[PDB]
Design a binder for this molecule. Structure first.
Ligand SMILES: *[C@@H](C)/C=N/c1c(NC[C@H](O)[C@H](O)[C@H](O)CO)[nH]c(=O)[nH]c1=O
Lengths: 98, 264
């Protein structure tokens, strides 16, 4: 039995257009461990992205945190793109901007 | 405050490239402390207060142990796959650890999983292994025949593990034992016509353990409360929320402090 990743996209602080913030993509509850994650700004991969090492949960699934520094604008759209064996093609999850 | 020490092992057969055959990492509470894998073949710190407090001799000695544990894990996965007549890539996992509770009592656990599911569970109080199926029962019989190993693992869980944890807690005390209180607000909004949603949102808190609930007229709710996961904000602190529909009040407890936000 395989478990597809839960994907949650949110800002570090309550978002406000114009003020420096951080964008998080928390990817969790998946199994097996192999996984691919990118942050996207207007459909294109962001390159200066931090991430934690693969992490282990008590229920044997895994989790990861990807983040990047950003300044939210009304115009720009951010997302988190994820691939995993349970997925036919990469899943793109839009940030809902609070 | 309650704390815990645990180590995981992860074994993958026939892995894709980029995926190590074997990984082992340690945690104190939610914080990574150690890591080893079949590519580095080295045990390394994952917290600065581990690196500063354990001499090179520690990393050397446990690197050798891990290299040994890596090979055992490979063989055990192969034997399991054979038992299940499985081919292709499968996973094998171990978790061992202990908790030092607030009241001072303790907890210990040791479990194995196959393809991400419970396989064998150790009971240190009976010195027995609980098996989920006939394959695990086969493995159990072998392990339960070795009385000394069972005694040894009971001792490690109850004495050694707890001693390691206390040791690590002191090393990382500036981190592990700090308190950062939640910033909490209630948000109100009409969504669907007629409906009013009430979100109680907390962020900026450490440790991640937080209690949030909604109440009406000073007593327990009965309607459906929705809970946000407790999520890492990336700076060492966490965030979370709870919502209901619609005098209401949000109640938050964190590290010995209770907070009430009355919805006017
Ligand atoms: C550095 C101390 C890494 N330790 C480590 C351990 N350590 C706990 C324990 O000695 C070990 O699990 C024995 O097998 C218990 O009988 N365990 C682990 O799985 N990974 C580690 O990196």
């Amino acid at each position: 039995i395989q478990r597809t990743p839960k994907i949650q996209v949110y800002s570090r602080h309550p978002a406000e257009n114009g003020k420096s913030n951080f964008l998080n993509c928390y990817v969790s509850g998946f199994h097996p461990s192999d996984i691919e994650v990118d942050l996207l700004k207007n459909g294109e991969r962001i390159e200066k992205v931090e991430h934690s090492d693969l992490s282990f949960s008590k229920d044997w699934s895994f989790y990861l945190l990807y983040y990047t520094e950003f300044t939210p604008t009304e115009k720009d759209e951010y997302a988190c793109r994820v691939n995993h064996v349970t997925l036919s093609q990469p899943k793109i999850v839009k940030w809902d901007r609070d | 405050r309650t704390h815990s020490l645990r180590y995981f092992r992860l074994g993958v057969s026939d892995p894709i490239h980029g995926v190590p055959e074997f990984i082992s990492v340690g945690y104190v509470d939610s914080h990574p402390i150690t890591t080893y894998d079949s590519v580095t073949r080295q045990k390394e710190p994952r917290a600065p207060w581990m690196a500063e407090n354990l001499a090179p001799d520690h990393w050397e000695r446990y690197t050798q142990l891990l290299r040994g544990w890596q090979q055992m894990f490979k063989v055990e996965l192969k034997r399991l796959q054979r038992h299940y007549n499985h081919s292709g890539s499968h996973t094998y996992q171990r978790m061992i650890g202990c908790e030092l509770l607030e009241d001072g009592s303790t907890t210990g656990f040791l479990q194995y999983a196959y393809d991400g599911q419970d396989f064998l569970i150790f009971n240190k109080d009976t010195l027995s292994w609980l098996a989920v199926d006939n394959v695990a029962h086969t493995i159990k019989q072998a392990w339960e025949a070795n009385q000394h190993e069972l005694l040894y693992q009971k001792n490690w869980l109850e004495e050694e593990c707890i001693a390691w944890l206390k040791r690590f807690l002191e090393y990382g005390k500036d981190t592990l034992q700090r308190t950062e209180p939640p910033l909490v607000r209630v948000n109100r909004k009409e969504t669907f016509p007629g409906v009013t949603a009430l979100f109680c949102k907390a962020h900026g808190f450490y440790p991640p353990e937080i209690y949030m609930t909604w109440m009406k007229n000073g007593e327990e709710i009965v309607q459906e409360i929705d809970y946000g996961d407790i999520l890492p904000s990336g700076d060492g602190t966490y965030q979370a929320w709870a919502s209901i529909e619609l005098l209401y009040s949000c109640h938050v407890e964190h590290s010995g402090v209770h907070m009430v936000l009355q919805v006017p």
